Amino acid sequence: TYQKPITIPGDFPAILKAFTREILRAQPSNIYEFGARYFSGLQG
Amino acid sequence: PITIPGDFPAILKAFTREILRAQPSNIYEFGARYFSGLQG
Amino acid sequence: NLADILKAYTKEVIRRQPTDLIAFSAKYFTNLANVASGVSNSSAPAKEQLRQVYTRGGSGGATLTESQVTGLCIADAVVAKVMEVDLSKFVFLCLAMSCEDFNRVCMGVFDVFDLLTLIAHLGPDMDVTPAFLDAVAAELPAGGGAVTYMELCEAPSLKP
Amino acid sequence: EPIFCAEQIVIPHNLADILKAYTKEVIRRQPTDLIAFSAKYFTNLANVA
Amino acid sequence: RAIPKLVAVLALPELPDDQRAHALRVLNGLLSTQEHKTNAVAEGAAPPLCQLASQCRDDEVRRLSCSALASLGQVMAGRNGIVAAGGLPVLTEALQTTPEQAAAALKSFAASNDGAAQLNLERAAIVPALVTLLSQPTDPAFTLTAFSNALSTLEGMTRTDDGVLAALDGGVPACLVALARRGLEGDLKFEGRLMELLQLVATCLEQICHHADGKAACRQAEAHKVLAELLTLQHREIIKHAAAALMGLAVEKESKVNVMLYAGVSLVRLMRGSDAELAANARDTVAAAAEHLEARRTAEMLLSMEE
Amino acid sequence: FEVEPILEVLVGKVLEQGLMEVLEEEELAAMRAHQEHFEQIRNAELVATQRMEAAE
Amino acid sequence: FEVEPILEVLVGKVLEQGLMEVLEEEELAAMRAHQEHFEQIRN
Amino acid sequence: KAVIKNADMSEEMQADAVDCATQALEKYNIEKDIAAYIKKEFDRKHNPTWHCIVGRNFGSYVTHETKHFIYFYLGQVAILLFKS
Amino acid sequence: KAVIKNADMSEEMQADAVDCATQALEKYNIEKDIAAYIKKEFDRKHNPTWHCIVGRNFGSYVTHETKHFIYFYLGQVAILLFKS
Asked: Where is the protein situated, by its record's location annotation (chain F) (predicted)?
């Protein structure tokens, strides 16, 4: 019937609060370098 | 564009102060007659 | 009391945000005070210019009649009269005081509505004389009952 | 111009746009810890940039 | 960042009756403020407010407490925490009192959810209990605000979980028939916001007759009286939602046939006039209910379909 | 010497509350406009869906 | 501690926006897919 | 609790100043009124010429009667209390 | 330029304070430095004590000697200056 949009952030709260914490601390001059190196460091 | 400009601060302050001084008996005639007096 | 009513005033003004704040506040407070509203919406009042109700003393049950008027919302007046059914006199007086008679008031009152007490009440809404209604009756076509507008407009075709 | 309270922070609506676009891309496929996929997302965003 | 002091004073053991209301009002204003919303949705401020509201044991205390819990619960993280800590106990207890604050406390959850009332739906008995509350009349014209809020709540929750509400005896068209049978006419509470209540009832009717369980509800109810009664105030949401409900009724052969055949002059007048906003859903209703009461097509052809 | 503090707190809290509440209420009403629009579009698509289901 | 509220407000806003947007887009895509299936039928 | 950074004051009087400043920062709402309550209470219980400054970004160059000066943090504000 | 937000001085003193502050700001930037310069100039010019506060966000509640109190902005930076 009505498909259930179960796409709810459960660990996305944690990850995005972390990421927006980083950016709000940083005030990036360029969005790309800060975001990409953030996710590279998360990889590391 | 939502910021109530500098007027309403002073207008509210004076309205409150004068209604306190006059101590009205009927609560809502005051603002109408008061703004009539303030117009001129 | 004072604090909550002033809260309501403030919320409404911080809802509007005009330019000429003194003048707008004056106009707003005056309109909230008086029943007479400068906007003066018609055909769907939304602003009780109830001088007719003041003349009535309540127009029947005051609370019930005002409840019907408030729950109302040409077509809106028709719906209000339908929901209601005195009260008809008040409704016609409203539809007149919101209009200007040119025999269009009479035709519209008949449409929204068996056409005697209507004119009887509408005479008092001028705050004419019953002799005018008597002359209209002497000129009345289809005198069996509720006439039609076109049928009745035979002798007194040139009328206000 | 040092900061006084929480209000002095300056991060524009561009960050909100970043986050909305990110959320759309990270809920379209439901990746759920997409870290490598997000890295490639940044890779081709740069390649376009 | 001093909302915590008011929070502690609120959650003190045996929250007294000295003021007990202005503290809650200030706390609600804070937890509403976009900053202090976070400062109360992340800084704890336990549901002891809900616990005391439940253990009211008074008259003028429970109403204010329930209003406070209501206003507190209409936030994303606030409602998430309420669910995680059993706030559904409050969202169930609140629907027990006739007062407007307590009654609308139940509705505020889904009214803010707009699709995230899964907690209320999983509390499947809570929806039937609140229906038993906001269907029986007691001190209306203030419970009417709660009624409209609950109608919006249903418009959301039923649209999300059609079978979940239709299976319950609250009924996708059964509650619509109950609303019509009440009429909510009273004296001064006809359609103040009850026009919007009817609008949300009709929107849930469309979104529930979408599902064949809602079709069973339409069969069990036959609530064209609801449309013929509340379609006169001319509310835009009411008109659009009611025409969409008629369109989605086509799943229910019974109620759709009844409505499309033994309708009022409202459909003919809507076709005649220029009510374009409702006209889309009205034409959808005509096209889908040409099947149920199949004589509807011939009746339309007779009634100047070549116009 | 009564005007100062009582009117200070009154006016200040009232003005701040209005400035917050207009913001929040307008945002939520915009949200509800969004939902009405896309739900009406999907309701038209859903009467099409009813035609789908009854096609067989 | 001086940033937490702003953190939260953008988090919630983007959560709701992304949710409803992708939701409705996928629903309309599915219904258009059913439409093209009916076009296949009418072939 | 509280933090006392830079002082020229007896320890018991520092404790009383912290208690006073904490009750003020709790009950009142605006920084100038915090200052007002602190000054009025030290006036009503010790001596007339007090001066209070509750700020969040400010640098001063003040003169104080000896054995009366405190510069301390409580939460999110810096309180300066001196006698003159 | 100079916004004399709240003062109770005289006109000669007014100009003296404003141009001394303007002079100080083009010399230094630290709050300590500006307050020190301004208040040393005013002590050596007028009277024994002068409490100077330099900052951007702060309250106050201070007892002043009549005709020796001023509170003005120079662009964005604010100066309180009072003798007691």
From this structure: Cytoplasm, Cytoskeleton, Flagellum axoneme
Class of domain C1-35: mainly alpha
Q: Which residues of F touch G35 (CB under 8 A)?
A: 48
- Please report the resolution in angstroms: 3.4
Residue C37 near residue C50, CB atoms below 8 Å:
no
Spell C78-104 as b/e; 16+ CB within 10 A means b: bbbbeebeebbbbbbbbbbbbeeeeee
**For residue F29, which amino acid is it?**
A
Experimental method: cryo-EM
Whether the Cβ atoms of residue C52 and residue C97 lie closer than 8 Å to each other: yes
* E173, E217 Cβ separation under 8 angstroms: yes
Q: Which residue of F has its CA nearest to H28?
A: F9
**Distance, CA of A17 to CA of E156 (rounded, Å):** 29
Residues of A with Cβ-Cβ distance to D32 under 8 angstroms: 11
Asked if the Cβ–Cβ distance from G2 to D5 is below 8 Å, we say yes
Burial of G39 (0-12, 13-18, 19+ CB in 10 A): exposed
What gap in Å lies between CA G22 and CA G13, rounded to an integer?
14
> Dihedral through CA E200, CA E204, CA E207, CA E211, nearest 10?
-170
Domain coordinates of chain D in residue numbers?
6-48
**What are residue I53's DSSP bridge partners?**
H60, I80
SS3 (DSSP) at I57: strand
The three-class DSSP label of residue I67 is coil
Q: In chain B, which residue's Cα lies nearest the Cα of F13?
A: B9
Q: Which residue has the tokens 């006039």?
A: E273
Residue located via tokens 């609308």: E104
Compute the half-sphere exposure of residue H7: CA atoms within 13 Å on the CB side of its CA.
Answer: 14
How many Å apart are CA C116 and CA C127, to the nearest integer? 18
- Complete DSSP assignment for chain D: ----SGGG----HHHHHHHHHHHHHHHHS--SS-HHHHHHHHHHHHHH-
**Sign of the C-alpha dihedral, residues E104, E109, E115, E120?**
negative
Number of residues that make up chain B: 40
DSSP 3-state of C56 = helix
Question: Is there a contact between A16 and G14 if contact means CB atoms under 8 Å apart?
Answer: yes
Judge whether E35 is closer than 8 Å to chain G, CB to CB.
Answer: yes
Task: Please give the biggest Cα pair distance in chain H.
Answer: 31
Q: Go through chain G and tell me how many residues it has.
A: 43
Give exposure, H51-74, as e/b (b: 16+ Cβ within 10 Å).
bbbbbbbbbbbbbbeeebbbbbeb
Closest to B15 (Cα-Cα) out of B31, B2, B28: B31
Task: Find, among E130, E47, E135, the residue nearest to E92 by Cα.
Answer: E130
CB contact burial C108-126 (16+ within 10 A = b; e otherwise): bbbebbebeebbebbeebe
Q: Which of E133, E218, E108 is nearest to E174 (CA)?
A: E218
- Pairing status of strand H77-83 against strand H69-74: antiparallel
Residue E213 tokens read as: 């369980």
What SS3 state is found at H60?
A: strand
Q: In 3-state terms, what secondary structure has residue C61? A: coil
> E207: how many CB neighbours lie within 10 A of its CB?
28
CATH topology of domain D6-48: cAMP-dependent Protein Kinase, Chain A (1.20.890)
Instruction: Please check whether residue E106 is in contact with residue E150, taking contact to mean a CB–CB distance below 8 angstroms.
Output: yes
